[PDB]
């Protein structure tokens, strides 16, 4: 009896009311009523995501796009899902694409995309990073076991030394007691092989090295009278595609007022020149 346009509104009220499983089911009746409407699917897709079930959302997006391959939201959400499924490559791609469309269609979300985009780039890198081998070392592999050895000679050759004088309760603490003595002795070591000119140290890219708009590494940093540093290429268009105001302080800014942050370029250059990765990031 209720119209699809009414069922959507209903779900809209629920979703705002955080009743995600209920709103989603509400969009489902509006879809059976009229499949040919992209909004429904993308909306329901957002319910599934909030309901932590990319399985469904992924499918529902793969339908909203069949009725609108130019859907910014559909692409954004689709990419989102892929993140959960851990398809880091595709995910960042659809976000990338969902970003261009949004820019193209002259839509405005701000951060919402470059942010999640930058986030998906970070969560991706995190993967192949913990996937590296680092390759122990000649002296390492050696001393590494020398300790594990000295440990057995105690826990398994000095613990049962007094099965009576030290029952379960006693040496159960006398066990981890020495274990920590060795887990640390070695701990100090690890830091040695890491600070010893070794690249085995976690490789990540700072934040103060990215733009306040692009949310990515800057190649032509320049600051404003306010003091915020953006990439000359991003606040370039924002000045001729959104207005004449600082995208942060919202101050009356104008293109011929941008100062080149030379000291920054330096810092950014030096970074790259030292970090092999990146470009792969």
């Amino acid at each position: 009896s209720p119209s699809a346009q009414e069922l959507k509104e209903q779900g809209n009220r629920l979703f705002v009311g955080r009743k995600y499983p209920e709103a989603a089911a509400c969009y489902g009746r509006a879809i059976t009523r009229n499949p040919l409407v992209a909004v429904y699917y993308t909306n329901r897709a957002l319910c599934y995501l909030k309901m932590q079930q990319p399985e469904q959302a992924l499918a529902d997006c793969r339908r909203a796009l069949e009725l609108d391959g130019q859907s910014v939201k559909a692409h954004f959400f689709l990419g989102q899902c892929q993140l959960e499924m851990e398809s880091y490559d595709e995910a960042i791609a659809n976000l990338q694409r969902a970003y261009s469309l949004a820019k193209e269609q002259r839509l405005n979300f701000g951060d919402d995309i470059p942010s999640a985009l930058r986030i998906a780039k970070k969560k991706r890198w995190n993967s192949i990073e913990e996937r590296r081998i680092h390759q122990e070392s000649e002296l390492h592999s050696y001393l590494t076991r020398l300790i594990a050895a000295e440990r057995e000679r105690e826990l398994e050759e000095c613990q049962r030394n007094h099965e009576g004088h030290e029952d379960d309760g006693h040496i159960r603490a006398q066990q981890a007691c020495i274990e920590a003595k060795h887990d640390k002795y070695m701990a100090d070591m690890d830091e040695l092989f890491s600070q010893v000119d070794e690249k085995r140290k976690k490789r990540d890219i700072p934040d103060y090295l990215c733009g306040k708009i692009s949310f990515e590494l800057m190649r032509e940093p320049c600051i404003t009278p306010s003091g915020i540093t953006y990439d000359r290429k991003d606040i370039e268009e924002h000045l001729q595609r959104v207005g004449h105001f600082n995208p942060v302080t919202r101050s009356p800014l104008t293109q011929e007022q941008l100062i080149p942050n030379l000291a920054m370029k330096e810092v950014i250059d030096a970074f790259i020149s030292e970090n092999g990765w990146v470009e792969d990031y």
Partner: peptide
């Protein structure tokens, strides 16, 4: 006063 994406319109 823009508009976010994590919103069902």
């Amino acid at each position: 006063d823009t508009s976010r994406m994590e919103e069902v319109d």
